[PDB]
Amino acid sequence: DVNLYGPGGPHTALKDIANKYSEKTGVKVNVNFGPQATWFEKAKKDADILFGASDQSALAIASDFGKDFNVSKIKPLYFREAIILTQKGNPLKIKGLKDLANKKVRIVVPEGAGKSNTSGTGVWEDMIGRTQDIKTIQNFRNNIVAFVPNSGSARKLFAQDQADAWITWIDWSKSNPDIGTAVAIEKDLVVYRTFNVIAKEGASKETQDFIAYLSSKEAKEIFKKYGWREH
């Protein structure tokens, strides 16, 4: 078996890819996902590949594994853009990030706060900071009602109508057409973060084979369906 572990997000593309791969090759590929704490102990025993939803978070998670993984071997393969997810119908008529700074809105964002490894860390400030206006930065921050440890937590909060806007990734919207309404972020502000993988030291032939498959034509198309790009 080839066992993958990583955060929620890329798991939807990976599940599809793994399904197709397993049927085609006979090799069983398992995609374990969620908050790091839910799978960390198990991963330490049988993780073949660690996948990531950003570089900083992947570096963090792989570093928790010590000798089993060499962090220098993290492989970026795709990227996707940040988006604003609004409640269905976008009742507040949010047009972008600047709009979120100037209106009265409840925003949720994943931030690790140094105790959780999440793809969201640093995202909101890097985007709104590109307005080069401290008042705008202050205004946006004042609207953040919740910093959460991971995207799954943001999704739950959002689903309970506890926030008007969730700063997230396009793939979360693609994976969940039924949840909210995606609003594109200003081209001059938006950030793009990567999907990546790292194989354990002494990875099996089956593991190496699947890694290659992630760059295959079939994999590219599935990734594309969820918003993951190469160029």
What is the DSSP secondary-structure string of the chain? Answer: -EEEEE-SSTHHHHHHHHHHHHHHH---EEEEESSHHHHHHHHHHH-SEEEESSHHHHHHHHHTTGGGS-GGG-EEEEEEEEEEEESTT-TT---SHHHHHHS---EEEE--TTTS--TTTTHHHHHHGGG--HHHHHHHHHTEEEEESSHHHHHHHHHTT--SEEEEEHHHHHH-TTT-EEEE--TTT--EEEEEEEEPTT--HHHHHHHHHTTSHHHHHHHHHTT-B--
Our CB check for a copy of itself shows the closer of 21 and 78 to be: 78
Is 9 or 180 the residue whose CB approaches a copy of itself more closely?
9
Distance CA 200, CA 35 (A): 20
63 vs 176 by CB, closer to a copy of itself: 63
Q: Is 171 in the site for a copy of itself (CB under 8 A)?
A: no
| Contact partners, residue 52, CB within 8 Å, separation at least 6 | 6, 7, 10, 58, 61, 62, 74, 119, 194, 195, 196, 197, 198
Does residue number 115 form part of the binding site for a copy of itself (CB under 8 A)? yes
Tell which positions 58-87 bind a copy of itself, by CB under 8 A: 59-61, 63-64, 71, 74-79
**Does 89 help bind a copy of itself (rule: CB under 8 A)?**
no
Residues 176-195 that bind a copy of itself (CB under 8 A): 188, 190-194
Least distance CB 77 / a copy of itself (angstroms): 7
From 11-19, 90-98, 100-108, 134-142, span contacting a copy of itself (CB under 8 A)? 134-142
Scanning residues 21 to 60, which ones bind a copy of itself (CB under 8 A)?
54-57, 59-60
Using the contact rule CB under 8 A, the part of the chain among 87-95, 96-104, 126-134, 153-161 near a copy of itself is 126-134
> How big is the chain, counted in residues?
231
Please select the residue that binds a copy of itself; options are 92, 137, 159, 179, rule is CB under 8 A.
137
- Give 126 or 218: the residue with its C-beta nearer to a copy of itself: 126
Comparing CB distances to a copy of itself, the nearer of 2 and 84 is 84
CB of 160 to a copy of itself, least distance (A): 20
Query: Contact residues for a copy of itself (CB under 8 A)?
Result: 54-57, 59-61, 63-64, 71, 74-79, 111-117, 121-126, 129-130, 132-135, 137-138, 141, 147, 188, 190-194, 229-231
